[PDB]
Paper text:
Here we describe the peptide binding properties of the common and functionally important cattle MHC class I allele, N*01301.
The N (position 1, P1) and C (PΩ) termini of the Tp1214–224 peptide conform to the canonical pMHC class I binding mode, anchored in the A and F pockets respectively of the N*01301 binding groove. The P1-Cα/PΩ-Cα distance of 22Å is typical of pMHC complexes and, as reported for other 11mer peptide complexes, requires a substantial portion of the peptide to bulge out of the binding groove. The peptide conformation appears to be relatively rigid (the electron density is well-defined for the full-length of the peptide) and is not the result of stabilizing interactions with neighboring molecules in the crystal (the peptide does not contribute to any major crystal-packing contacts). This interaction results in P5 extending deep into the binding groove, the side chain conformation further stabilized by hydrophobic stacking with Trp73. The main chain conformation of the P6-P8 bulge is stabilized by partial hydrogen bonds of the P6 and P9 carbonyl oxygens to the Nε of Trp73 as well as intra-peptide bonds between the same carbonyl atoms and the main chain nitrogen atoms at P7 and P8. The bulky Trp73 residue thus appears to play a defining role in the location and stabilization of the P6-P9 bulge conformation. Overall the binding of Tp1214–224 to N*01301 results in an interface of 1040 Å2, one of the most extensive interface areas for canonical pMHC complex structures reported to date. The results shown in the present study indicate that the very prominent C-terminal bulge of the Tp1214–224 11mer when presented by N*01301 and the highly stable nature of the structure, are likely to be key factors in determining the dominance of this epitope over other parasite peptides bound by N*01301.
Residue numbers in the entry:
A (entry chain B): 1 to 99
B (entry chain A): 1 to 277
C (entry chain C): 8 to 18
The structure:
Amino acid sequence: AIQRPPKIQVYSRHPPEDGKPNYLNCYVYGFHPPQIEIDLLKNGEKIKSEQSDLSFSKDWSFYLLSHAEFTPNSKDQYSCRVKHVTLEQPRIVKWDRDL
Amino acid sequence: GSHSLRYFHTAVSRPGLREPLFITVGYVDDTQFVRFDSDARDPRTEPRQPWMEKEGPEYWDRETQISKENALWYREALNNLRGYYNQSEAGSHTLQEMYGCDVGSDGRLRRGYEQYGYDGRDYLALNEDLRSWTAADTAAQISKRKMEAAGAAERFRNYLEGTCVEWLRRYLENGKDTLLRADPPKAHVTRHPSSEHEVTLRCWALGFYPEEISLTWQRNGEDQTQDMELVETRPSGDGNFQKWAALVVPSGEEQRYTCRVQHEGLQEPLTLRWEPG
Amino acid sequence: VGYPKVKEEML
């Protein structure tokens, strides 16, 4: 009966600047069980991404990084969408480039 | 400096597929160096650091072979645990294992580990004496009795005291540039004004290795952790880490607040304030 | 290197 919801951070590897190549990351952690879907969105649609190898922390909870090379610019909006048994609907977390 | 070699297994049953999902990942300190994924097209143990290419094809073949056998072992374990708990084969369950060794600067075994988790809880653990076990409940007491009757602890203790410590030494030499570094965080405070009365200060620490770091906020030798948001440390994606600590302060009082960053790559703790420009 | 599990030592 142990079900822990994911925590999500969305962020660029480097401080972002228009027309400079970069990497977009969605780190998803603290979750259990391990089945999970993690999609990077560009303007609300799925872009191609790669995902790190399933690993876990001391309390058994899992963590994954979903990542894609991207070139930020003034128009494009990014987000990460996560589906998990503990979430009644998919959770979308917007990339806040001004944090 | 002390160091660790750790492996992490995750087995996930998959009702109505031929096999569970079995994943192994290995780490030296906070760097991932190998993986195995039973779902790959041709499952093999693979390097996750360039300096692992120093190991020849026997290394890869052997790690691959034991991973496959490990996958079979986990399949049987998952079945047995469901039996102990009267859990239907229709439902998915998760077995997890962490194991490895810590070595001191002196290069010798400081501590060995072997711990199992079942559906996210502690199940069975090898004690620090490396000869007795701790079972979380009566199911795990069945597993404990099996491990005792099989003499499992002895074989694992031999690995830890020999192979584990010896290979960690080798990995530490082959990846010395990656592994023996202490990259201090680059730190700065940024300002985020919601209104003319309140502003959020965010203390950022970027590009640091290893993972352990302390970010705290102070007003006047007075610690602010009750008001601060501290995010979990996150990966850069390129072998380093990132973290921040934010707190809401009154507009015009920004200079009353200091961020203190402590990290192994720093000669002294950084103390920072938000700086115009 | 990692540790080989053996079937005779089973949960």
